[PDB]
Structures are given as structure tokens and as C-alpha cells.
Design a binder for this molecule. Structure first.
Ligand code: CA
Ligand code: MG
Ligand code: MG
Length: 107
């Protein structure tokens, strides 16, 4: 929905990673349309994925990343989770803050 994504691009990005261990976060961001948005929409997305409003994406939220796009989406595997987290958490504190998330999507 949010961050001005198109419903057809969300639907086709979930179809591309529907199989376990097929998710690659850089490919998903590009398919879903977010890699090209403005930073203001990038931030909107971050604050949706930060479900408890802590101002970070914790690893448990990151595991449920696709269920922000569709309630019945699968959880990420541990492998998928770990990859995404090591690329998103550049300051090493074990969770994603808003500047580091933006830097990851636009890198
Ligand atoms: Ca959070
Ligand atoms: Mg929480
Ligand atoms: Mg961090």
C-alpha cells in the first residue's frame, strides 16, 4: 500500500519471492518500486515496517517484513533475515535505524 507503492508491483514482487529462500531484499526493493522513490516515501515505508514505533526495525519485525505488504505473506527464513539485517544495520547495533535503512535502499 503506503510509500505510494502500486498494487500491481506489490503483487508481482510477492509472486517473485514466494518460495522460501528466494527473497533478496535488493531485488524486492527494486521490483516493488521503492528503490526509486523519494526519501520521503522511503521513510514512510520504514515507519510502517517499524511496527512497535520504537524508531528501529528489530530483527523480529524484519522477519515479518512481507506481512506489511500482505497479511498472509510468509515469514522470512532465518537466512533471509540475517542477510537483510547485516546489510541494513551498518552501525552494528543489531537493528535498523532510519538513516541506515535509507542508505541501504539508495546504495
Ligand atoms: Ca521497531
Ligand atoms: Mg517490537
Ligand atoms: Mg543499526
Amino acid at each position: 500500500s503506503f510509500a505510494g507503492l502500486k498494487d500491481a508491483d506489490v503483487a508481482a514482487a510477492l509472486a517473485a519471492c514466494s518460495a522460501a529462500d528466494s527473497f533478496k531484499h535488493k531485488e524486492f526493493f527494486a521490483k516493488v518500486g521503492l528503490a526509486s522513490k523519494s526519501l520521503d516515501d522511503v521513510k514512510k515505508a520504514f515507519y510502517v515496517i517499524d511496527q512497535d514505533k520504537s524508531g528501529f526495525i528489530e530483527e523480529d519485525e524484519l522477519k515479518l517484513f512481507l506481512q506489511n505488504f500482505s497479511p498472509s505473506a510468509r515469514a522470512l527464513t532465518d537466512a533471509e533475515t540475517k542477510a537483510f539485517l547485516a546489510d541494513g544495520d551498518k552501525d552494528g547495533d543489531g537493528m535498523i535505524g532510519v538513516d541506515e535503512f535509507a542508505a541501504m535502499i539508495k546504495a
